[PDB]
C-alpha cells in the first residue's frame, strides 16, 4: 500500500508578488520537484517518468505548466472578488494523488487548504467545501464549479491518470522502494538520561528498546522519525534512569535490514 502525493504550496504576499513550489512523493520517497524558478518539472529519481512515453509526459508537463500560470491569476482574482472579506498575505496548499491498494483498487484525493486550514476538496464531479469552512467560500466554489473544462480535466486526472501513472511508478521504482539499509547505533548520556541513537535505516518500521537482559524497560521513550539527507531515517530512544545505575543497560534494535541479528549495545 503506497500513497502518491503531489503537494503544492503557493504564497501571495500582495497583489503582484507570488510564488508556487511543488514536491512529489511516493510513500516516503521524493519523485519530482517543480520550483517556482523552473519552467519544467524535475525528476528526482531515474524512474520518475514511470511507464509514461515521452509524448505522454510532455503532454502532461505542459498541462501543469499552463495550470501554474492559470492558478496564480485565478487566486489573485478570487481575492479581488471577495475583498475586503479576505486580503494578502495568503497561503494556499494543495494535496493531490491516490492511495494504491492490492491489484486493481485505488482511491484518489484532492485537498485544498487556505491559511493552513483544510477548506476545499474535489469530490465526485465538483469542488465542495468541507465541514468548518467559512461560508464566503461559497462564491469561489460557485465560480470554480462553473468551469466545465476544469472539471472534466480534474476528473480525468483523479479517476484515470493518477492510478495509471502510479502503477507504472511502482514497477519502475521497485528497486528503490524495496531497498534495505541497515541502521547504525550509538549511546550517550545527559545531566541522568540515556539516549540510544539509531541512524541510517530504511524502510521506516523499526523497533528500539532499552533492556536489562530479557527484561523490557518501560520508560523507554522513542522520539519521532527524523530524516537524513540520503533518504534513510533517524530515530532515538531516551530512558530515564537514576545516577549510578547504567550498569547492565543495553539498547536493542530490530530492523528488516539486519535480518535476524539484532543490534545490542551496552554502557
Amino acid at each position: 500500500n503506497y500513497t502518491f502525493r503531489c503537494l503544492q504550496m503557493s504564497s501571495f504576499a500582495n497583489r503582484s508578488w507570488s510564488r508556487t513550489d511543488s514536491v512529489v512523493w511516493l510513500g516516503d520517497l521524493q519523485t519530482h520537484r517543480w520550483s517556482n524558478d523552473s519552467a519544467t518539472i524535475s525528476f528526482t529519481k531515474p524512474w520518475s517518468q514511470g511507464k509514461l512515453s515521452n509524448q505522454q509526459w510532455e503532454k502532461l508537463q505542459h498541462m501543469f505548466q499552463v495550470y501554474r500560470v492559470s492558478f496564480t491569476r485565478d487566486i489573485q482574482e478570487l481575492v479581488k472578488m471577495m475583498s475586503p472579506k479576505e486580503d494578502y498575505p495568503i497561503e494556499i496548499q494543495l494535496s493531490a494523488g491516490c492511495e494504491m491498494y492490492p491489484g486493481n483498487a485505488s482511491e484518489s484525493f484532492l485537498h485544498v487548504a487556505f491559511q493552513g486550514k483544510y477548506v476545499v476538496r474535489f469530490w465526485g464531479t465538483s469542488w465542495q467545501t468541507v465541514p468548518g469552512a467559512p461560508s464566503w467560500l461559497d462564491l469561489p466554489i460557485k465560480v470554480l464549479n462553473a468551469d466545465q473544462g476544469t472539471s472534466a480535466t480534474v476528473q480525468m486526472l483523479l479517476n484515470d491518470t493518477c492510478p495509471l501513472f502510479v502503477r507504472g511508478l511502482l514497477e519502475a521504482g521497485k528497486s528503490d522502494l524495496e531497498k534495505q539499509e541497515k541502521p547504525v547505533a550509538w549511546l550517550s548520556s545527559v545531566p541522568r538520561q540515556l539516549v540510544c541513537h539509531v541512524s541510517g535505516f530504511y524502510p521506516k518500521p523499526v523497533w528500539v528498546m532499552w533492556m536489562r537482559g530479557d527484561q523490557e524497560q518501560q520508560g523507554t521513550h522513542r522520539g519521532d522519525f527524523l530524516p537524513n539527507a540520503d533518504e534513510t531515517w533517524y530515530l532515538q530512544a531516551t530512558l530515564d534512569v537514576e545516577a549510578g545505575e547504567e550498569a547492565g543497560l543495553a539498547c536493542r534494535v530490530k530492523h528488516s535490514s539486519l535480518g535476524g541479528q539484532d543490534i545490542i549495545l551496552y554502557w
Partner: T-cell receptor, first 113, second 111 residues
Framework: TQVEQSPQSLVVRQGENCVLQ??????????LRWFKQDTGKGLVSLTV?????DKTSNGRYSATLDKDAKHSTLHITATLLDDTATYIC?????????????FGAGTQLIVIP | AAVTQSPRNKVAVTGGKVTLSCNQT?????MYWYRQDTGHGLRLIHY???????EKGDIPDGYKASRPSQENFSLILELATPSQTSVYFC??????????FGPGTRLLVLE
C-alpha cells in the same frame, strides 16, 4: 496582439460564399466566439465553439475550431446584403467569470447586391 | 438577460467631466467596461465584481470606475481628452464565462 483575423477586409457579390480566419496565441483557450457587428451598432453573437476540435452552425453561418492549431474559420454560405458588417473573433481564457476575453480587430465584409 | 447604456452619444470638450453609465437588471455580480477603436479589438478599461468594488483593466488611465449598486456601473472621465474619443461598451455576467454586452456609447471629445 494575441488574436489575429484574416482577411482584414473583403468584398463579395450576393450569393457568394466566404470564409473568415481567426488565429490566436491565447493560453489557455477555453472557448471562441464569433460576433457580428453592423456599422454604428452592437455585438450580436453568431456562435461559440468549445471543444478541442469543434464544429458549429447557425443558419447560413458555420464554424470550425481546432485547438491544437489554435485556428478557427467562419463560413458564411450564400451571402446577403445584410451580411455587410465587421466580424469579430473572441477567445476566452477560462470557463468561468474569472476569464478575460481577447478580441480580434475584426474582419470587414461588404456584399454587393 | 439585457444591459443598458446611457447616454447613447455624447459630444464633450477637453477638460470636461464626462460620465458614462451602465444599467443591468439581471442581478449579475460582475460588470465590465470596454472601449473599441478601429484597428484594435475591444480593450478592457475597468471592471467590478460587485457593489463598492472596482478593478483596473488593461488601459485604466484617464478613467475612474464606480459601482454604487448591483445594478449600476459607471465610467468616469474627470478630465476628458481628444484621445478618449471612442465607442464604449459595457457588459455584465454571473459566474459563467458569457459576457452580455450593452448597445455601446459613442463619445467625441473636441478641443
Amino acid at each position: 496582439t494575441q488574436v489575429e483575423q484574416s482577411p482584414q477586409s473583403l468584398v463579395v457579390r450576393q450569393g457568394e460564399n466566404c470564409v473568415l480566419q481567426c488565429n490566436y496565441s491565447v493560453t489557455p483557450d477555453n472557448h471562441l466566439r464569433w460576433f457580428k457587428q453592423d456599422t454604428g451598432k452592437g455585438l450580436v453573437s453568431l456562435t461559440v465553439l468549445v471543444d478541442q476540435k469543434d464544429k458549429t452552425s447557425n443558419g447560413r453561418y458555420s464554424a470550425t475550431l481546432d485547438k491544437d492549431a489554435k485556428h478557427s474559420t467562419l463560413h458564411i454560405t450564400a451571402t446577403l446584403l445584410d451580411d455587410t458588417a465587421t466580424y469579430i473573433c473572441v477567445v476566452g481564457d477560462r470557463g468561468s467569470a474569472l476569464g478575460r476575453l481577447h478580441f480580434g480587430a475584426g474582419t470587414q465584409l461588404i456584399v454587393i447586391p | 438577460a439585457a444591459v443598458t447604456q446611457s447616454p447613447r452619444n455624447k459630444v464633450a470638450v477637453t477638460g470636461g467631466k464626462v460620465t458614462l453609465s451602465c444599467n443591468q437588471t439581471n442581478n449579475h455580480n460582475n460588470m465590465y467596461w470596454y472601449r473599441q477603436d478601429t484597428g484594435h479589438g475591444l480593450r478592457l478599461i475597468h471592471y467590478s465584481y460587485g457593489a463598492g468594488s472596482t478593478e483596473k483593466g488593461d488601459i485604466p488611465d484617464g478613467y475612474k470606475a464606480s459601482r454604487p449598486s448591483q445594478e449600476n456601473f459607471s465610467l468616469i472621465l474627470e478630465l476628458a481628452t481628444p484621445s478618449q474619443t471612442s465607442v464604449y461598451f459595457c457588459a455584465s455576467g454571473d459566474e459563467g464565462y458569457t459576457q452580455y454586452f450593452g448597445p455601446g456609447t459613442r463619445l467625441l471629445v473636441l478641443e
